[PDB]
């Protein structure tokens, strides 16, 4: 049974940086690409980027490119997505998703509700 | 960017009746004769779940009442007889060209 | 038909035709035949990259019979992708011009 585990929540300050984790289990981690997608309230789903954990090849949505960084750790079968210069516009639920090559996303992470606040 | 527009924003369908959701693309999502477009279902508190791929193909485990059709720029998701658990938000997505884009989402409710 | 779910094996070396197209011959290893063969091309970064099929509609009539596919790939470096999922055939191709 395939599982992509993410922490439930992050509370980060505006302008700060965050590094989100996606811990894969139930399959050979390096056999499938990992994508990142976020869901903002009333604004739908937005694609951030993808990475091949085997070869570290990647591609970003140009909107996030100067601001984001996709990495993996093969040893721990964990994918990471880092996003810096955060504003309130980056408050969303962040999902990692496994690519059913070369089509759809077959397995979605548990999701990380991210709040960008001065508190 | 290929823009995907869904219609309607939300709709309510009487239990056992037919439901239809459309997705329109600002340009073609066809790649070698196949439509690179997908339909996901999302319920509150849950991550999305794939239902239909390449416009018309049913993911295994998905009930037969779900179907999809269309090509190039016009697509539709159909549930020929809705049940209670069909209430969710539905999103179309394309990956015919980077960056991947998602439709705005259509929220389906059930009456009865 | 529905898309093939199974795996594909490359039967011959990929060949360039006289007119800038490629001939791909694959062998199917599935149970759901007849089905349509997933065929696409990507770039290095996994981006979907345009081209056209010369073959009408790639279909597996008989899983013991290899299927020919003629295609006009994009120019330059691409990957021909036959099938879908973890076992998807991913083949490097360069088209001069
Ligand atoms: Cl490592
Ligand atoms: Cl469910
Ligand atoms: Cl949610
Ligand atoms: Cl059901």
Residue numbers in the entry:
A (entry chain H): 1 to 119
B (entry chain L): 1 to 30, 30A, 30B, 30C, 30D, 31 to 108
C (entry chain A): 299 to 395
According to the publication:
The ectodomain of the DENV E protein is composed of three domains: DI is a central nine-stranded β-barrel domain, DII consists of two finger-like protrusions from DI and contains the hydrophobic peptide required for virus fusion, and DIII is an immunoglobulin-like domain on the other side of DI that has been proposed to interact with as yet uncharacterized host receptor(s). One such DIII-specific neutralizing MAb from our panel, DENV1-E111 (henceforth termed E111) potently neutralized infection of a genotype 2 DENV-1 (strain 16007, EC50 of ∼4 ng/ml), but inhibited infection of a genotype 4 virus poorly (strain Western Pacific-74 (West Pac-74), EC50 of ∼15,200 ng/ml). E111 bound to a previously uncharacterized epitope centered on the CC′ loop of DIII, which should not be exposed on the virion according to existing flavivirus atomic models; our structural data defining the CC′ loop epitope of E111 was supported by extensive mutagenesis and binding analyses.
We initially formed complexes of E111 Fab with soluble, bacterially expressed DIII (residues 293–399) cloned from 16007 and West Pac-74 DENV-1 strains (and data not shown). Several conditions yielded diffracting crystals of the 16007 DIII-E111 Fab complex but failed to diffract better than ∼6.0 Å resolution. As an alternative strategy, we cloned the heavy (VH) and light chain (VL) variable domain sequences from the E111 hybridoma to create an scFv. Two constructs of the E111 scFv were generated, with either the VL or VH sequence at the N-terminus, separated with a (GGGGS)3 linker, and a C-terminal hexahistadine tag for affinity purification. Sequential purification by nickel affinity and size exclusion chromatography revealed two species of scFv: a non-disulfide domain-swapped dimer and a monomer. For our structural analysis, we used the monomeric species with VL at the N-terminus. While E111 showed a higher affinity and longer half-life of binding to DIII of 16007 (genotype 2) compared to DIII from several other DENV-1 genotypes, this did not explain the disparity in neutralization potency for viruses from all five genotypes. While wild type DIII of 16007 binds E111 with a 37-fold longer half-life than the A345V variant, the on-rates were equivalent. These experiments suggest that at steady state, DENV-1 16007 has a broader ensemble of conformations compared to West Pac-74, allowing for enhanced exposure of particular DIII-specific epitopes for MAb neutralization.
